[model samples]
Target: GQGGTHSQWNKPSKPKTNMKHVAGAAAAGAVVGGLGGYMLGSAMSRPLIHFGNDYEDRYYRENMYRYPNQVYYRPVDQYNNQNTFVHDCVNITVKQHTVTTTTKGENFTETDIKMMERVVEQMCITQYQRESQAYYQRGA
Candidate 1:
């Protein structure tokens, strides 16, 4: 069994209607977008997901440790590099989704996983928007 606990909020239920698909998509977009925005705020910041189990394996973990309880690591994107930033993003996002399902009071499902993928994609979009905004703002 997975040692880590899933968040209690995102459990799945039978889709009441096809509407759930749309709702899920929208929700995914919102989360992804929000995360993307966060990434912008953290541009120079390292990625979130990492290779091994805990922060010890992550390069950024030390940086994160410096902050300790004051700040937490957030994922910037999926794992494309050994860079902890991307890994952190994947790890946190996965954990967040797991928590989201748990919070929803249902078990995980294929649909839930699908929604998460969309959410991750949305996050990428958000990152673009955030960076663009920041660039324009700085110039202004």
Candidate 2:
């Protein structure tokens, strides 16, 4: 018998055509393609802007005070707790430094609504102070 020819060694061996390997390759390609498509879509999407909650700390950082020309509602107090009195106003002005609010109750007394609005303003001030101090740290 003759020995194998050198040309056999020179010829490239055929790649393994296992079904598992083919499936795996296809799956990987699909995953990569999907990710690329998603990236492209997101890039083309418009920039999204959002406003935080009215009571959030960042709200205060932006100096976005609430209650200016905003409505405020207060429930009437009673010893019997049977009077279902409710007041609504829309003349509340929230100041930056000072806590002063003016309420114009639509169909209720202004004094009661003013008290409630002032309390809410005070709460906002407290929230502002807490958030500011936590975010700002001195050289301590």
Candidate 3:
């Protein structure tokens, strides 16, 4: 009876404080707000819309007569009409060429430049073609 009375109850359990995996905030590259902004060359010694080489094609037209011998060297141009040339009277070609302009700032795209250059190239081509046709009429 005395031994039972003196028996100690459970009272000395130690604390476990080693829990570290809970702070998984390493989240790699905490991208702190960089998704927010944007923006936007040449001398004219030579025309960007200039002809690479004229009369590359042996194309024939109806007005010039289809006499097969009409292998006419029409001074015709193709963007042949980049905004940079006037194969036509350019009266209209020039007017049109003038109309299609490019402002280099936010959108200095080669995409647009190519197109603009194309327009100029075409315009000049038309003018050149007009002259060509004129010349064609005279010669053949």
Candidate 4:
């Protein structure tokens, strides 16, 4: 007589095919996402653009000025080497003033005036002597 017991035990297999299918989907997603971001970034690039005026123009020309229509000088950069007279005709009057107001202080007497004249004359003559001695080195 055949025993006819349940001959084979039903071994349930896990869905390994579905795991392989999930791996394929993940790789497909990675390829699509990487290429999509790269091509989108390439298309999104723009030219370097400027918005407004730069400060360099102001620095070159007008860092010191916003003028009311006036001329400006850089400076007397060149040295004028001629010996300047202490009692120059133009410079003598710069020292010529005195307070003649009696209420202020001491007034100029004749002796004081003479003393000033003597000092001025002495300085002018001394500068003349210096020019003769050093004229070879003087320029301008």
Go through the candidates in order and give each one's C-alpha lDDT: 0.43, 0.30, 0.33, 0.32
Give per-residue CA lDDT, model 2, range 16-125, as digits (tens): 77765333333321123322321100011221222354433343333322223222222222212212111111122222113332343243234333433443444333
Model 1 lDDT at residue 91: 53
lDDT of 3 by residue, 11-101 (tens): 8689976776554445422122431211000112222333353331111121113111101111333325433234322233223223343
lDDT: the better of candidates 1 and 2: 1
How do the predictions measure up, each by TM-score?
Answer: 0.29, 0.24, 0.21, 0.26
Location of the lowest summed lDDT over 10 successive residues in candidate 4: 38-47
Error of 2 at 10 (Å): 15
Off by over 4 Å in 1: 1-90
Which candidate achieves the best lDDT against the true structure? 1
lDDT of 4 by residue, 28-138 (tens): 211233224211000112212222445433332332121111111111222143234332411332132342334466554443443344333444444444444554456
Number of the top TM-score candidate: 1
Could you give me the TM-score of model 4 versus the true structure? 0.26
